[PDB]
Structure 1
Amino acid sequence: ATFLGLSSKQEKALVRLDKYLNLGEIAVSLVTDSATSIKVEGRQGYYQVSYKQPHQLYRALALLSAALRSGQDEVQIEEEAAYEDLAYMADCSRNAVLNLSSAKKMIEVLALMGYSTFELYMEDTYEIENQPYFGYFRGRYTVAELQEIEDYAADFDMSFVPCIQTLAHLSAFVKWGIKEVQELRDVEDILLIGEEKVYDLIEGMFQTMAHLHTRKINIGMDEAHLVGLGRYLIKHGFQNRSLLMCQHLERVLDIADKYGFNCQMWSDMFFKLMPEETRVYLDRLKERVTLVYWDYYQDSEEKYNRNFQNHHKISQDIAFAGGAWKWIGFTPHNHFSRLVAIEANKACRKNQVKEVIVTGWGDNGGETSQFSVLPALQIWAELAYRNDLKKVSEHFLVSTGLDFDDFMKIDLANLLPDLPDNLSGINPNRYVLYQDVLCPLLEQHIRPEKDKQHFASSAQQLGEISKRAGEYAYIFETQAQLNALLALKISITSGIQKAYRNGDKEHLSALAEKDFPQLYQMVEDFSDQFSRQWQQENKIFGLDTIDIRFGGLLKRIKRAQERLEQFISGQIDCVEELEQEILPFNDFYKDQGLTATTANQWHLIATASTIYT
C-alpha cells in the first residue's frame, strides 16, 4: 500500500506494523477530523482514512485491512469511541516482569486494537536511587528500560502510565532484615505513615518516574485493614484509619506536585464520603486526584450503575477499571472476562465514563501467559469503539494473525462442563495441578470422571490449535500439556484412593509401575514447556519460585510412588496418608452448590503442613 498524508513518525509505525496489516496494492489518503473517532471510506483501490486521535490511525488501518480480507471492495466504516482513554495494565509485580521485546509486541497489538494507553503495575520492580534493596533480585526495570517502553508506545502516539504503590502492597521489599528497610514498616506489607524516611522513599519513586515524559501516574492508595495498627500504633497510639490515610495522601500528593505529576488512585478510601475535620480533609483531597472504580466480577449493568451513582455523589472525575482475568493460575478466563465486559461497558456508557482501564493482574507467581488475554483485550476494544462484538473475529485476525474462537479455547482448563457462567475465579487448572497425590486436599471438589474427560478432550483440541497458532503456538502447547497432565493426575489420585480403600494391591502395583513414571515425566515436560513460555515473555527473575513449586510437586509424586511400593512389598503395614478422611477444602461456593471452587494460594493447596510460618 502507498499513502498520502503520513508523517515520518507514522511511516516508521507502519513499517513496524507491516506484518500485521495486509493492505495489498491500494492507495490510502489520511485526514485528521474530530467529527468522528474513525472513518474509513473508499472503493476500487483508493481509500480515505480519518482519525480523531493520532493513535486511532492504527485501529483505522486494522479495520481497513480486515474489510479487504473479508472480500470487500467498497468500504464504509465509521466509529465513535465511548472512551477518550482506553488502557491496558499488565502486572509486573507477581514475579513475572514483562521483557522489553514482549512489551513491544503488546504495544503493537494494543495499537491495532485501539488502546490509547499502556500501563505497568510495579510495586517494587523499578529502580530507586539510594534504595538498593528495592527490586533486589526481582528483575526491576532500569530507567533506561522504562524510557524504552514509554518511547515505543509514543511511536504509536500512545501514552504510558506507571501504576505504583505509595503505602501498601510492598511485600517483596519490606521482607529485607536491614534497618534501613525495617524502619520503613508499619506491619505486614504496609509502610509507616508519618515516617520521614518513608517520604524519602516515596520522593525516590517520583524521581525515578520523573525521567519519563508522562506526568500521569497511578499511586495505588487502597485501604489496607491494618494501616496504623503495627509500629505506628506502638509509636503513636491508636488513630482513625481515614485520618492517617488523609495525612499520608496529602504528603504523597505534595511530592507528586513537586515533580509535576497528576495522580490516579483506587476510589476505596473515599467510600465513606459517598469527625468533622476528617470529612473536610477527604473533601479537599478528593479534588486533587482522579478516582478509579475497580470492579472485575459483577454480572449485571445495574450493579455497576449503582456504584457509579454513588461515586458521582462525590466526584465527576471517575475512571473505571475492569478485568482481563489472568490471575488464577496457568490458565486465563477470557470467557468470564467477556461476560462482565459486556455489562461493564453498558454501565460505563450510561454514566459518561471517559477512561476505562483493563487490568491484567497476575496473583501469586505470575503463572499465566502475558498474552493469554488477547481475546479479552479485543473484546473491550470492540465494545469501546463499536458497542458490539459483531466484528470481533475479523479484527482479532489482524491483531493476532489467528482465529478468535480458537484463541478463546486457551481457557479450557478452567471451563469445567456445566459450571454457571457468572461465577468468578473457579480455577481447577491450578489446584488440580498443585494438590498432593497422597494427601489430595481438593479431592472432594473434583468430579473424577467428568473432569478427567474434560481435560483429556481439551488437550486434544489445544493440540490441533497449536499446529495452526503461528507465533503463539507456544502458549497453546503449554495449555495442551497441562490439560493432558491434569487428566492423568486425576486418574492416578482418585485411583489410589479407591484401590487403597478396597485393598487392591494389584491395581496399586499397576499405578506404581506404569502410571507414576508417566505422570512424573509429563510434569517434567510441562515444567520444560512452561520455562520456554516464561523466557519468551518475561525476565528470568521470578522463574525460581515456579522451579520451587514444580520441584516440590515432582518430589511429592516420587514420594507417592515410593510409599505405595513399600506398602505393596510389605515394608510398611499401611499408608497413613491414605487413611485420613478428606474434608471440603473451603466453602467459598457452598451457597451456590458447586463442587468445584476457587483456590488461589499455592502454599495452602500443596500441603496442610506449615511451610511459611
Structure 2
Amino acid sequence: ATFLGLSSKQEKALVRLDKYLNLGEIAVSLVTDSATSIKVEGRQGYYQVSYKQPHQLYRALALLSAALRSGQDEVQIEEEAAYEDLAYMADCSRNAVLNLSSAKKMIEVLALMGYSTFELYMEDTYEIENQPYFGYFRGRYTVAELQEIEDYAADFDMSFVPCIQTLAHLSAFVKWGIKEVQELRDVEDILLIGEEKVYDLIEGMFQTMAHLHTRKINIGMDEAHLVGLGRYLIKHGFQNRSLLMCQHLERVLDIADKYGFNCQMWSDMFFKLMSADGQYDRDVEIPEETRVYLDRLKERVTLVYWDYYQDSEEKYNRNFQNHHKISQDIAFAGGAWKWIGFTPHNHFSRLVAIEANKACRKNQVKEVIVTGWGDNGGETSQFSVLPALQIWAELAYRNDLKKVSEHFLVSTGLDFDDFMKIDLANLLPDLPDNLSGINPNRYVLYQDVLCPLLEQHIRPEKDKQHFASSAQQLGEISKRAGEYAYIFETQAQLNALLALKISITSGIQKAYRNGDKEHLSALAEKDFPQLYQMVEDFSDQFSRQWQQENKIFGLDTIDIRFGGLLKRIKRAQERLEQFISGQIDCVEELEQEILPFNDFYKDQGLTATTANQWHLIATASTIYTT
C-alpha cells in the first residue's frame, strides 16, 4: 500500500504492524477530520482514513485490513467510542513478570484493537534506590526496562500507567526479617500508616517512576482489611479508620504532587470501612467528618470501581450510584479472566462485559481498565485472553460484537471461535453460565490421589468424557494457531491429563471400597506410570510457555508444585502396591469419608465448585503455618 499524510513517527509504527495488516496494492489517505473516533471510506483501491486520537490510527487501519480481508471492496465504516481511555493491565506481581519481547507484542495487538493505554501491576517488582530487599529475586524491572516498555507504547501514541501499591498487597516485600523492613509494617501485608520510614519508601517509589515520561499512576490501596489494627494500634490506640485512610491518602498525594504525578486508586476500602458488615457492594452513610475530608480529596484522585462478576446491568448501576454520592470522577475496572489456574474464561468474560458496558455507558464513565490478574502463582498464559480483550474493544467502539470475528483475525491471525476454545478445561457440561470462578482445570490437576479433597465435586464419567473430547478438539486447533500454537498445545495436554487423572483417582475409590485388588493392581502397574509421564511432559510444555512469555524468576514456585504432585503420585503407587502384596492390611487414606470441599455453590445446586489456593487443594495438613 501507499500512503499520503503520514508522519515519520506513523511510518515507523506501520512498518512494525505490516505483518498483521498486509494491506495490498491500495492507496490510503490520512485526513485531518476529527468528527468521529474512526472513519474509513472508499472503493476500487482508494481509501480515506481519519481518527480523533492519534493512537486510533492503528484500529482504523486494522478495520480496513479486516474489511478487505473479508472480501469487501466498498468500505463504509464510522465508529464513535464511548470511552476516552481504554486500558489493559497485566499482572506482574503474581510470579509471572512479562519479558520485554512479550510486552512489545502485547502493545502491538492492543494498538490494533484500539486500546489507548498499557498498564503493569507491580507490587514489589521494580527497583528502588537503597531498597535491596524490594523485589529481591523476583525479576524486578530495572528503570531501563520500564523506559523501553514505555517508549515502545509511546511509538504507537499509547500511554503507560504503572499500577503500584502504597498500602497493602506487599507480602513479597514485608516477609524479609531485616530490621529496616520490619519497621515498615502494620500487620499481615499492610504498611504502617504515619511512619516516616514508610513515607521515605513511598517517595522512593515515586523517584523511580519519575524517570519515566508518564505522570499518571495507580497508587493501589485495595484490600487493606486490618489497616490500623496491628503495630499501628500498639503505637496509637484505636482510631477512626476511615479518617486514617484519608490521612494516608493525603500524605501519598503530596508526595505524588512533588514529582508531578496525577493519581488513581482502587475504591473498595471506603465502602468496606463504612458499611455495617464490611462489604464493597453497599450503599453507605458517610460520617460528616469523613464526608468533608473525602469531598476535598476527590478533587485530587480518580476512584476506580472494580467489578469482574455481576451478570446484569442494574447490579453495576447500584454501585455507580453509590460511588457518585462521593465523586463524579469514577473510572471502571472490568475483568479478563485469567487468574483461575492454567486455563482462562473468555466465555464468562464476554457475559459480564456485555452488561458492564451497558452500565458504564449509563453512568458516563470516561475510562475503562480491563484487568488481567494472575492470582496465586501466575499459571495462565499472558496471551490467554486476547478474545476477551477484542470483546471489550468492540463494545467500546461499536456497542456490539457483530464484527468481533472479522477484526480478531487481523489482531491474531486466527479464528475467534477457535481461540475461545482455549477455555475448554473450565467449560464442564451443564454448568450455569452466569457463575464465576468455576475452575476444575486447576483443582482436578492439583488434588491429591490418595486423599482427593475435591472428589465430591467431580462427576467421574461426565467430566472425564468432556476433558477427553476437549483434548481432541484442542489438538486440531493447535495445528492452525500459528504463532500461538504453543498455548493450545498446553491446553490439549492439560485436558488429556485431567481425563486420565479422574479415571485413576475415581477408580481407586471404587475398587478399594469393593475390595477389588485385581483392579488396583492393573492401575498401579499400567495407569500410574502413564499418569506420571504425562505430568512430567506437562511440566516441560508449561516451562516452554513460561519462558516464552516471562522472566525466569517465579517459575520456581510452579516447579515446587509440580514436584510435590509427582512425589505424591509415587506415594499413591507405593501404598497401593503394599496393600496388594499384603505388606499392609489397609490403606487408611482410602478409609476416610470424603466431604464437600466447600459450600460456595451448594445452593445453586451444582457439583463443580471454585477452589483457587494451591496449598488448600493439595493437602489437608499444615504447610505454611507454624
Q: Would you say same fold, with TM above 0.5?
A: yes
What is the aligned partner in structure 2 of residue 35 from structure 1?
A: 35
Structure 1 residue 243 displacement after superposition: 1.6
Structure 1 residue 33 displacement after superposition: 2.3
Superposed CA deviations along residues 225-279 of structure 1, whole A, max 9, x for unmatched, are 2101111111111112112111111110000010010000112233389954333
Is the 1:325–1:360 Cα contact (8 Å) retained in structure 2?
yes
Structure 1 residue 223 displacement after superposition: 4.5
Is the 1:273–1:314 Cα contact (8 Å) retained in structure 2?
no
- SS of the aligned residue for 1:40 comes to strand
- SS of the aligned residue for 1:581 comes to coil
Is the 1:13–1:155 Cα contact (8 Å) retained in structure 2?
yes
- Of the candidates 315, 326, 348, which is equivalent to residue 327 of structure 2? 315
Superposed CA deviations along residues 102-125 of structure 1, whole A, max 9, x for unmatched, are 000000000000000000000000
Report the Cα distance in structure 2 between the residues aligned to 1:505 and 1:490, rounded to whole angstroms.
19
Superposed CA deviations along residues 134-182 of structure 1, whole A, max 9, x for unmatched, are 0000000000000000000000000000000000000000000000100
Structure 1 residue 314 displacement after superposition: 1.9
Superposed CA deviations along residues 282-318 of structure 1, whole A, max 9, x for unmatched, are 2211221001111100000111111112212221111
Superposed CA deviations along residues 384-439 of structure 1, whole A, max 9, x for unmatched, are 00110001001000000000000000000000011000000000000000000000
RMSD (Å) for aligned C-alpha atoms: 1.0
Report the Cα distance in structure 2 between the residues aligned to 1:602 and 1:588, rounded to whole angstroms.
17
What is the aligned partner in structure 1 of residue 587 from structure 2?
A: 575
What is the aligned partner in structure 2 of residue 77 from structure 1?
A: 77
The change in CA–CA distance for 1:403 and 1:272 in structure 2 (over 3 A counts) is closer
Is the 1:328–1:427 Cα contact (8 Å) retained in structure 2?
yes
Report the Cα distance in structure 2 between the residues aligned to 1:584 and 1:519, rounded to whole angstroms.
25
Report the Cα distance in structure 1 between the residues aligned to 2:302 and 2:420, rounded to whole angstroms.
34
Report the Cα distance in structure 1 between the residues aligned to 2:43 and 2:477, rounded to whole angstroms.
35
Q: Structure 1: 5+ residue runs without aligned partners? A: none
Report the Cα distance in structure 1 between the residues aligned to 2:559 and 2:295, rounded to whole angstroms.
48
Report the Cα distance in structure 2 between the residues aligned to 1:278 and 1:125, rounded to whole angstroms.
34
Is the 1:88–1:357 Cα contact (8 Å) retained in structure 2?
yes
5 Å-filtered alignment, 1:505-544, equals 505-544=517-556
Superposed CA deviations along residues 561-583 of structure 1, whole A, max 9, x for unmatched, are 01101111111111110000100
The change in CA–CA distance for 1:273 and 1:584 in structure 2 (over 3 A counts) is closer
Superposed CA deviations along residues 340-365 of structure 1, whole A, max 9, x for unmatched, are 00000011111111100000000000
The change in CA–CA distance for 1:314 and 1:273 in structure 2 (over 3 A counts) is farther
5 Å-filtered alignment, 1:109-124, equals 109-124=109-124
Report the Cα distance in structure 2 between the residues aligned to 1:608 and 1:376, rounded to whole angstroms.
35
Report the Cα distance in structure 2 between the residues aligned to 1:26 and 1:568, rounded to whole angstroms.
75
- Of the candidates 339, 348, 351, which is equivalent to residue 339 of structure 1? 351
Report the Cα distance in structure 1 between the residues aligned to 2:596 and 2:623, rounded to whole angstroms.
21
- SS of the aligned residue for 2:61 comes to helix
Superposed CA deviations along residues 199-219 of structure 1, whole A, max 9, x for unmatched, are 000000000110111100000
Report the Cα distance in structure 2 between the residues aligned to 1:243 and 1:33, rounded to whole angstroms.
49
Structure 1 residue 221 displacement after superposition: 1.4
The change in CA–CA distance for 1:593 and 1:106 in structure 2 (over 3 A counts) is same
Q: Structure 2: 5+ residue runs without aligned partners? A: 275-286
Q: Bigger shift: 113-122 or 344-353?
A: 344-353
What is the aligned partner in structure 1 of residue 87 from structure 2?
A: 87
Determine what percentage of the aligned residue pairs are the same residue. Answer: 100
Is the 1:273–1:282 Cα contact (8 Å) retained in structure 2?
no
Report the Cα distance in structure 1 between the residues aligned to 2:118 and 2:188, rounded to whole angstroms.
30
Report the Cα distance in structure 2 between the residues aligned to 1:276 and 1:391, rounded to whole angstroms.
50
- SS of the aligned residue for 2:331 comes to strand
- SS of the aligned residue for 1:42 comes to strand
- SS of the aligned residue for 1:76 comes to strand
The change in CA–CA distance for 1:453 and 1:544 in structure 2 (over 3 A counts) is same
Structure 1 residue 550 displacement after superposition: 0.2
5 Å-filtered alignment, 1:354-369, equals 354-369=366-381
Report the Cα distance in structure 2 between the residues aligned to 1:372 and 1:214, rounded to whole angstroms.
28
Report the Cα distance in structure 1 between the residues aligned to 2:291 and 2:66, rounded to whole angstroms.
53
Is the 2:37–2:80 Cα contact (8 Å) retained in structure 1?
yes
- Of the candidates 368, 392, 400, which is equivalent to residue 388 of structure 1? 400
The change in CA–CA distance for 1:572 and 1:347 in structure 2 (over 3 A counts) is same
5 Å-filtered alignment, 1:206-605, equals 206-271=206-271, 276-605=288-617
Is the 1:437–1:556 Cα contact (8 Å) retained in structure 2?
yes
With structure 1 as the length reference, what TM-score do the two structures score? 0.99
Structure 1 residue 382 displacement after superposition: 0.4
- SS of the aligned residue for 1:605 comes to helix
Report the Cα distance in structure 2 between the residues aligned to 1:244 and 1:95, rounded to whole angstroms.
31
Is the 1:292–1:318 Cα contact (8 Å) retained in structure 2?
yes
What is the aligned partner in structure 2 of residue 148 from structure 1?
A: 148
Report the Cα distance in structure 1 between the residues aligned to 2:532 and 2:583, rounded to whole angstroms.
23
Report the Cα distance in structure 1 between the residues aligned to 2:273 and 2:508, rounded to whole angstroms.
57
Paired residues in the alignment total 613
Q: Bigger shift: 475-484 or 267-276?
A: 267-276
What is the aligned partner in structure 2 of residue 2 from structure 1?
A: 2
Q: Bigger shift: 55-64 or 264-273?
A: 264-273
Superposed CA deviations along residues 28-65 of structure 1, whole A, max 9, x for unmatched, are 00013221000001111110100110100000010000
Q: Bigger shift: 320-329 or 279-288?
A: 279-288
Is the 2:336–2:389 Cα contact (8 Å) retained in structure 1?
yes
The change in CA–CA distance for 1:223 and 1:466 in structure 2 (over 3 A counts) is closer
Is the 2:224–2:269 Cα contact (8 Å) retained in structure 1?
no
Q: Bigger shift: 242-251 or 447-456?
A: 242-251
Q: Bigger shift: 590-599 or 364-373?
A: 590-599
Report the Cα distance in structure 2 between the residues aligned to 1:118 and 1:225, rounded to whole angstroms.
29
Superposed CA deviations along residues 500-539 of structure 1, whole A, max 9, x for unmatched, are 0011111001000000000000000000000000000000
